[PDB]
DNA sequence: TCAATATCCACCTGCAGATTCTACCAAAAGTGTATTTGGAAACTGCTCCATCAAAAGGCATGTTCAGCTGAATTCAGCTGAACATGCCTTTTGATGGAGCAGTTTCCAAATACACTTTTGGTAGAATCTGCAGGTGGATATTGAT
DNA sequence: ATCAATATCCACCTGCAGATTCTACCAAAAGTGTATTTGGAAACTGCTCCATCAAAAGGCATGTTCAGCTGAATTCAGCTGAACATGCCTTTTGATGGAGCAGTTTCCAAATACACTTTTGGTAGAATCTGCAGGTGGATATTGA
């Protein structure tokens, strides 16, 4: 069928605002958001690997992509969050 | 009787509309306009209702934005009334003209 | 049909855009811009339709057209 | 025992992986790439939800709607920059009237 | 050492076809190479997107053609589509 | 084995069909690439460079030069509505701008 | 007389001249220093291919030149002939740059 | 090697005037020169930041023309002529 | 300042459309098992990026000096705003179908693989020639009278 | 209208950079033969997208009045454009290290590949509940006086 990030957005919603809910129209907005950012990051990682003649996209490419796409503070935290998830996963 | 001075009601509406989010263009007329233009690219097309809504949303967000840049251009010429030369200037700088 | 987009509706749009006073010539001017905008978007959309060999324009077709015209829309499938 | 739980994320790592592979972005995809990418997607999601949640709370409402996501984004310098060429349907605009237009 | 590919050779042939008498400075050839690479990417990119939106795994001349129609303006599109279709049907005709 | 015929000649083109096919496969555009895709792409590319060289060459002639340089490429692009749109967000190094002075600025 | 051109005459003479030519209008060495200064503040120990510095200059000059055209349009729109900071700001605002 | 400071002033009044000329500007206010320098600074910084980001991702110590080309391209400021 | 008109701002109130919530199934997603292979080390070869020297002269810096442009001030002719006044579409529902996106399943045609052959295309070299940079007069354009 | 001052053209020259053309080799593009899908058939099946009325309100289309905004005209205090004297520092030209990019060659740690083996995310109907939309009632804000 059709798959979305809805379920995940909602789980994350409960962590930041347990008491808050979200209209479906707004859920649609969040999906568009997740999809868009995903494309942007994936797309830049794709180019980074191509410019450097590599056939694989590693956490290193996703990181530089994030660094090139997100404004200052957003980049730092995103970068923090990312390496944090990758280290924890490696353990 | 009792009349509000020119502009007083104008400011009132700016406040009302900048506060709301409903589409400001009558729905039927819009759908009618969309199909007419589409008919020129391919005949007998059907439209998903959500497709028409996406167009009206994009279209209204675009005009509203364009009206902001236009207002700025008019304020720049030390006026308070927007004019075609204002919409024209803004579209040129934006790279649409 | 373009005339269906009425003076009072254009006024409202301008109002959401913070415009206080409007010259009489703005209405026709606005329609022309509105039409060019819709023609460009719809043309790209129907091109996605015709490619998918369909006869129905989908919201995704529009969303894709918008995206490539630099007018990314959120809320209709991307 | 899913990768998301191992990475300690609420976002679908396995799916981000599958999407990266089927999106024709590169010939191969590292094991950590989807983990990283998913963490980043989750963090921005929480960031928006946090502010739109505050926006709803300030409107004395408990359900986040489009208007709230628009106020959270446009009122935030960085999110605004990031979504500068994006339009949130049914989100309206920020209240803002040019001084010169004010009366008297 | 190592060789660097380029379209110079082809750009030069086409040049001779339209302007037998005319030459081109390397800087101008450098710009022509950027142009060819740019449009190639714009077209393949849009083609790749087209194929993906339609759950198709292969990019056929049909994708390249829609990409061209979406990318190029008016006349340019029409003429390019003509040459494109012409080369294909000629190519397939053995 | 058999008479080696390039796909370009077989296609009636100057531009490299093989090269273009290769670029497609190694560009991560799609899992598979049709045989007609590079042929159609090479032809569009060749047509577009023919169009701008035609105009650039004329610009050169008008400036009494036999060798096309970047400025000639600018004139050709900026003076043709369609190419200008197509390259509307591109900058040509050493191409300069089109001579153009707003009327109000000229001596009354 | 001694002979003396009226203000504006030489300016138009300069517009015709520079729109006629394609060379870079900012001096090379100074521009190179600006690049190295800015780069250095982001990252130390950086060196540059000469064409990288020239690509940056070509880019900055095309950018400023195009910005001055919009700026010029904003001034003319205000019934003026002299570009002012406010005009450059209106242009960058509408262009969606800093806004 | 000497310290680098105030190089933005190397973008002289005469050079800014020339650029405005090519841009078709006839009359220039006295405050234009500092605004221009400011505007150019921001433009350069952004392109250099992305360019240097590509350099570092490539583990190089040298910024290449390609680095700048990719930096410009991603800022919607595509440049022809140094692509090789 | 005063009196009053029409506009907001509120705390309540209550269905109702749109939300959390229930209870099962396939299409992932997580697992072992080779099978491959991309691309960090390790070196070197050898571009080309800093630095330096030394010599001009193009071009930046500062000043004068005053033309004419940006900015106040006025002023009044119209253009738009505010407002009833009617009256004609847009809106809101329920069909009732008919058009058609989505599967199914099928294979003939169209790629992807593999493994050699056969050359078109990329360095450098050697060879070739637009035109940059100078000059000296024909217009041409400006600005004072 | 007229000069005369000064700024353009407009050919005419000729050696250099830089183009072009000439050669020698591989890195690729071409053949062939062999598995592997791809995705365009024709037949059906439930959406869901029009065409159909209805009936209202709304919301839009029409004059009326006149408030106050936008130009037009006038004035003038400098700001910013020429022109000129000075001489600084960017340009030009080699001449060198070596810093550090690319090539070539190893291999492992890290991806594919593949059959299974659970599991989770979706979808189609259960139970609710966050607010929209209305309401008297109480200050506001805006105006004419
Ligand atoms: Cl106008
Ligand atoms: Cl990885
Ligand atoms: Cl094909
Ligand atoms: Cl200013
Ligand atoms: Mn010809
Ligand atoms: Mn290998
Ligand atoms: Mn004076
Ligand atoms: Mn004036
Ligand atoms: Mn009056
Ligand atoms: Mn049917
Ligand atoms: Mn050969
Ligand atoms: Mn010359
Ligand atoms: Mn000095
Ligand atoms: Mn070393
Ligand atoms: Mn479950
Ligand atoms: Mn309410």
**Three-state secondary structure of E29-93:** HHHHHHHHHHHHHHHHHHHHHHHHHCCCCEECHHHHHHHHHHHCCHHHHHHHHHHHHHHHHHHHC
Calpha distance B80→B71 (Å, rounded): 8
Angle (CA) C16 C20 C26, round 5° = 85
The b-or-e profile of F35-51 (16+ CB within 10 A means b, else e) is: ebbbbbbbbbbbbbbbb
Cross-chain Cβ contact A28/C73 below 8 Å? no
CATH 1.10.20.10 given to domain E1-94: yes
The CATH number for A1-91, chosen from 3.30.1180.20, 1.10.20.10, 3.20.20.70, 2.60.40.2470, is: 1.10.20.10
Question: Chain F residues with CB inside 8 Å of E63's CB?
Answer: 37
Angle (CA) C65 C67 C69, round 5° = 70
Domain ranges of chain F: 1-108
Q: Which SS3 state, helix, strand or coil, does residue E19 take?
A: coil
Q: Are E62 and E50 in contact (CB under 8 A)?
A: no
Cross-chain Cβ contact C73/D87 below 8 Å? yes
Among C46, B37, F20, F43, residue whose Cα is nearest residue E65: F43
Distance from the CA of E59 to the center of ligand 14, in angstroms? Answer: 46
Ligand number nearest to the C-alpha of F32: 3
Fold of D1-104: Histone, subunit A (1.10.20)
Give the bases of strand I that a protein CB approaches within 7 Å: 5-8, 18-20, 28-31, 38-40, 46-51, 59-61, 67-71, 79-84, 89-92, 99-102, 110-112, 117-124, 130-132, 142-145
The domain in which residue H28 lies consists of 1-84
Local structure of residue C3 (DSSP, 8 states):
G
The continuous run of DSSP H or E covering G32 comes out as: helix G28-42
Local structure of residue C20 (DSSP, 8 states):
-
Find where tokens 């670029």 sit.
Answer: F23
Task: Please tell me which of the candidates A23, A69, A86 has its beta carbon nearest to residue D32.
Answer: A86
**What are the beta bridge partners of residue E39?**
none
Q: Separation of CA C24 and C1' I80 in angstroms?
A: 7
Ligand number nearest to the C-alpha of G81: 8
Domains of chain B by start residue, with CATH: 1-97 (1.10.20.10)
Among H81, F56, F88, F77, residue whose Cα is nearest residue E33: H81
CATH number at residue C63: 1.10.20.10
Q: Are C22 and B30 in contact (CB under 8 A)?
A: no
Among H56, H59, H83, H57, residue whose Cα is nearest residue H70: H83
Find where tokens 């045989």 sit.
Answer: F35
- Which residues in chain C (19-78) have CB-CB distances under 8 A to chain B? 19-23, 25-26, 29-30, 33-35, 37-39, 41-43, 45-47, 49-50, 55-59, 61-63, 66, 71, 73, 75-76
B-chain residue closest to G71, CA distance: B93
Q: Which SS3 state, helix, strand or coil, does residue C2 take?
A: helix
Q: Which chains touch G (3 or more CB pairs under 8 A)?
A: B, F, H
Using CB atoms within 10 Å of the CB of residue B13, give its burial: 0 to 12 exposed, 13 to 18 middle, 19+ buried.
middle
Dihedral sign for Cα B24, B28, B32, B34, please: positive
- The answer for residues whose C-beta is within 8 angstroms of residue F43's C-beta and 6 or more apart is E80, E83, E84, E86, E87, E88, F11, F13, F15
**Structural domain tally of chain C?**
1
Q: Are F18 and F25 in contact (CB under 8 A)?
A: no
CA–CA distance from G35 to each of C35, F92, H76 (Å)? 45, 21, 20
Method: X-ray
Structure-token pair, residue H17: 């005037």
**Three-state secondary structure of D74-97:** HCCHHHHHHCCCEEECCCCCCCCC
Local structure of residue B40 (DSSP, 8 states):
T
Domain F1-108: give its CATH architecture. Answer: Orthogonal Bundle (1.10)
Cross-chain Cβ contact A46/F27 below 8 Å? no
Task: Please tell me which of the candidates F94, F97, F101 has its beta carbon nearest to residue G12.
Answer: F101
Resolution of the structure, angstroms: 2.7
Distance from the CA of D27 to the center of ligand 2, in angstroms? Answer: 13
Instruction: Count CB-CB contacts under 10 A for residue H34.
Output: 14
């Amino acid at each position: 069928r059709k798959e979305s990030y809805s379920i995940y957005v909602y789980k994350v919603l409960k962590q930041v605002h347990p008491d808050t809910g979200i209209s479906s129209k707004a859920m649609g907005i969040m999906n568009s958001f997740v999809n868009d950012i995903f494309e942007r990051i994936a797309g830049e990682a794709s180019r980074l690997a191509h410019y450097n003649k590599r056939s694989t996209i590693t956490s290193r490419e996703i990181q530089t992509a994030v660094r090139l796409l997100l404004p200052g503070e957003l980049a730092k935290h995103a970068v923090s969050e990312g390496t944090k998830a990758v280290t924890k996963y490696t353990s | 009787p009792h009349r509000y001075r020119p502009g007083t009601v104008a400011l009132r509406e700016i406040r009302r509309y900048q506060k709301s989010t409903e589409l400001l263009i009558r729905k039927l007329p819009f759908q009618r306009l969309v199909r007419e233009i589409a008919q020129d690219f391919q005949t007998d097309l059907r439209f998903q209702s959500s497709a028409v809504m996406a167009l009206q949303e994009a279209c209204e967000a675009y005009l509203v934005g364009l009206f902001e840049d236009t207002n700025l251009c008019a304020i720049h010429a030390k006026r308070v009334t927007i004019m075609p030369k204002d919409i024209q200037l803004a579209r040129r700088i934006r790279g649409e003209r | 049909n373009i005339q269906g987009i009425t003076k009072p509706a254009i006024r409202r749009l301008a109002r959401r855009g913070g415009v206080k006073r409007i010259s009489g010539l703005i209405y026709e001017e606005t329609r022309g811009v509105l039409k060019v905008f819709l023609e460009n978007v719809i043309r790209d959309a129907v091109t996605y339709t015709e490619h998918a060999k369909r006869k129905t324009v989908t919201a995704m077709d529009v969303v894709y057209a918008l995206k490539r015209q630099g007018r990314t829309l959120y809320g209709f499938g991307g | 025992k899913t990768r998301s739980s191992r990475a300690g994320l609420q976002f679908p790592v396995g799916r981000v992986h599958r999407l990266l592979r089927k999106g024709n972005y590169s010939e191969r995809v590292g094991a950590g790439a989807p983990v990283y990418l998913a963490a980043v997607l989750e963090y921005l999601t929480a960031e928006i939800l946090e502010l739109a949640g505050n926006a709803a709370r300030d409107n004395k409402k408990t359900r986040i709607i489009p208007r709230h996501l628009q106020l959270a984004i446009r009122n935030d310098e960085e999110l605004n920059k990031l979504l500068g060429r994006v339009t949130i349907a049914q989100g309206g605009v920020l209240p803002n009237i040019q001084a010169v237009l004010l009366p008297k």
